[PDB]
């Protein structure tokens, strides 16, 4: 086991960390057909999506997506302080793979 | 992959943007047969519904109506602040497609 | 589609509106067999129940009952003023069909 | 149907009420195989468990245990104030039947 | 049945206790394939993992796994303040089995 976000992130091909150290600026949640996604923003314009679940997503992968969106929300809403993000740079916007929180 | 709500909205036919910049005045919720839904209001009188799930409801779409419901509830209690709303104008009350939260 | 809590209650047969404009005095919960339920109490003395699901509920309704059980708990913990309650008046305690919370 | 914890407690035969009028002092939760449960405590030492969901249970019951677990964490974190508790006394510790939180 | 964290941990031999009497320093959640889990950190630099739901789990536990991720998140964001930890010792990072929270 990886022990940290950095180490975790290292284990995937099209990956990358962002070091935010700030709370999310906006949260968007879509229910719209094929657009069942959440998008987040930082005051610097850093925009990130939580992916539309696909069949490219394992079983394990899928639920734990619903959880990432539960997390984005409570963080957004409690005024967070996001540290870093692990992300799939091979998408626009960048796909959140993992989040790290620390005050 | 849309990077904001406005754009997202644009990917559809009976759609429309509301820019409120206000928290929900009221929140309504129901379990009575065939009217299993939620309804939000604002102090200008603008009312919006989260629909009762039916056919034209992808299973993934379906799970997503549920999360909307959690969302308008917590947003309601946390003294909200809803920037935008993508809605199906071909409904009455207007059908919530997506929500945008900005501070 | 109902536009508010009042015309929605009207859609139903053995219903009626109480308008409280007050917070929940007490909340109660049982996991006891055949009594898996919740009970609300208002300071004036008014008592209501979130009914135990049995045949008389449509599957969809069941999912709704759990969300209802969720809203009452949180409104309670928060001291969320409860505006109205649409209530099936053919049960004792009065069985809740819908809840309205206003600012 | 019953409209208070007292009437409901009494519908069962290996029961008793505890009147605490105080917030939960400690909250313990476990994923230990076969010991999937929680234990609550009060300041002076009273201990109660929410059971591992099995086969003396009725099923309607199985989800209602889940929510009891939810109610006790939230009540813990938000420093609640337990009015009452209905408990199966033929079990050590005391297995929570129902819970009462009063304003 | 166990009466406390100490008791429970006491039933396994590949399990060890940690007493922290501190609130979590960092919370890390991942949805990356084969890495769907969470990581928590203490300022003493103590690091813990909630395991990915593998073959060494019972279906009861899987549900509980979910719950533990819910607890850690609530505790983190709430400045929780964890007392003790009963952990699975034959792994690194040490994997959680049960938590105790007192205040």
Q: Cβ D60–C92 below 8 Å, yes or no?
A: no
- Alpha carbon dihedral E97, E101, E102, E103, in 10-degree steps, equals 170
Residue from A60, A42, A73 nearest E32 by CA: A60
Cis status of the peptide bond prior to E100, with omega within 30 of 0: no
> How far does the CA of residue A24 sit from the closest CA of chain B (Å)?
9
> How far does the CA of residue E1 sit from the closest CA of chain D (Å)?
7
DSSP code string of E50-92:
E----TTS-HHHHHHHHHHHHHHHHHHHHT--EEEEEEE-SSS
What are residue B43's DSSP bridge partners?
none
D residues 18-37 closer than 8 Å to C (CB): none
Measured between CB atoms, does B55 come within 8 Å of chain C? no
Q: Cβ A99–E35 below 8 Å, yes or no?
A: no
Q: Cα–Cα distances in Å, from D65 out to C73, D17, E8?
A: 15, 18, 20
- DSSP annotation of D16 reads E
Question: What span, in angstroms and rounded, lies between the C-alpha atoms of A92 and A79?
Answer: 25
Measured between CB atoms, does A13 come within 8 Å of chain B? no
The 10 Å Cβ neighbour count of residue A55 is: 6
Q: Cβ C67–B34 below 8 Å, yes or no?
A: no
* Cβ C61 vs Cβ B33: under 8 Å: yes
Question: What span, in angstroms and rounded, lies between the C-alpha atoms of B30 and C15?
Answer: 13
Measured between CB atoms, does A102 come within 8 Å of chain B? no
Q: Cα–Cα distances in Å, from A77 out to A30, A51, A72, E95?
A: 17, 20, 8, 29
What are residue C86's DSSP bridge partners?
C17, C98
Q: Look at the alpha carbons of C21, C23, C26, C30 in this order and tell me if their dihedral is positive or negative.
A: positive
- Residue numbers in B near A34 (CB within 8 A): 58
Q: Cβ A58–E28 below 8 Å, yes or no?
A: no
| Angle subtended by helix axes A59-78 and B59-77, to nearest 10 | 20
Residues near C84 by beta carbon (within 8 Å), at least 6 away in sequence? C5, C6, C17, C18, C19, C20, C99, C100
Measured between CB atoms, does D75 come within 8 Å of chain C? yes
End-to-end CA distance of chain B: 24
* Cβ D32 vs Cβ E97: under 8 Å: yes
* Cβ D102 vs Cβ D83: under 8 Å: yes
Q: Which residue of D has its CA nearest to C72?
A: D71
Cis status of the peptide bond prior to E93, with omega within 30 of 0: yes
Q: Cβ E26–A102 below 8 Å, yes or no?
A: yes
Residue from B36, C45, A61 nearest D4 by CA: C45
* Cβ D67 vs Cβ D99: under 8 Å: no
Q: In CATH, what is the architecture of E1-103? A: Beta Barrel (2.40)
Question: What span, in angstroms and rounded, lies between the C-alpha atoms of A26 and B3?
Answer: 12
Copy the structure tokens of residue D4. Answer: 């208070």
Q: Look at the alpha carbons of A58, A83, E75, E48 in this order and tell me if their dihedral is positive or negative.
A: positive
Copy the structure tokens of residue D82. Answer: 């337990």
Measured between CB atoms, does C55 come within 8 Å of chain B? no
Measured between CB atoms, does B65 come within 8 Å of chain A? yes
Q: Cβ E31–A101 below 8 Å, yes or no?
A: no
Q: Where are the alpha helices (DSSP H) in D1-103?
A: 5-9, 60-77
Question: What span, in angstroms and rounded, lies between the C-alpha atoms of B53 and B66?
Answer: 9
Q: Cα–Cα distances in Å, from D80 out to C44, D63, D69, E2?
A: 22, 22, 14, 25
Measured between CB atoms, does E97 come within 8 Å of chain D? yes
Question: What span, in angstroms and rounded, lies between the C-alpha atoms of D103 and D89?
Answer: 26
Q: Cβ B1–A49 below 8 Å, yes or no?
A: yes
Q: Cβ C29–D71 below 8 Å, yes or no?
A: yes
> How far does the CA of residue B65 sit from the closest CA of chain A (Å)?
6
Resolution limit in angstroms?
Answer: 2.4
Q: Cβ D27–E63 below 8 Å, yes or no?
A: no
Q: Cα–Cα distances in Å, from C80 out to C77, C100, D81, D96, E72?
A: 8, 11, 17, 27, 26
Q: Cβ E28–A1 below 8 Å, yes or no?
A: no
Please state how this structure was obtained: X-ray
Q: Where are the alpha helices (DSSP H) in chain B?
A: 5-9, 59-77
List all chains that touch chain B, counting a touch as 3 or more CB pairs closer than 8 Å: A, C
List all chains that touch chain C, counting a touch as 3 or more CB pairs closer than 8 Å: B, D
Q: Cβ E60–D92 below 8 Å, yes or no?
A: no
């Amino acid at each position: 086991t990886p022990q940290n976000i950095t180490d975790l992130c290292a284990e995937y091909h099209n990956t990358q960390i962002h070091t935010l150290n700030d709370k999310i600026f906006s949260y968007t949640e879509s229910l719209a057909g094929k657009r069942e996604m959440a998008i987040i923003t930082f005051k610097n314009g850093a925009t990130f999506q939580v992916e539309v679940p696909g069949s490219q997503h394992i079983d394990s992968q899928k639920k734990a997506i619903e959880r990432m969106k539960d997390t984005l929300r409570i963080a957004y809403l409690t005024e967070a302080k996001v540290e870093k993000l692990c992300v799939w740079n091979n998408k626009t916007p960048h796909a959140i793979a993992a989040i790290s929180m620390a005050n």
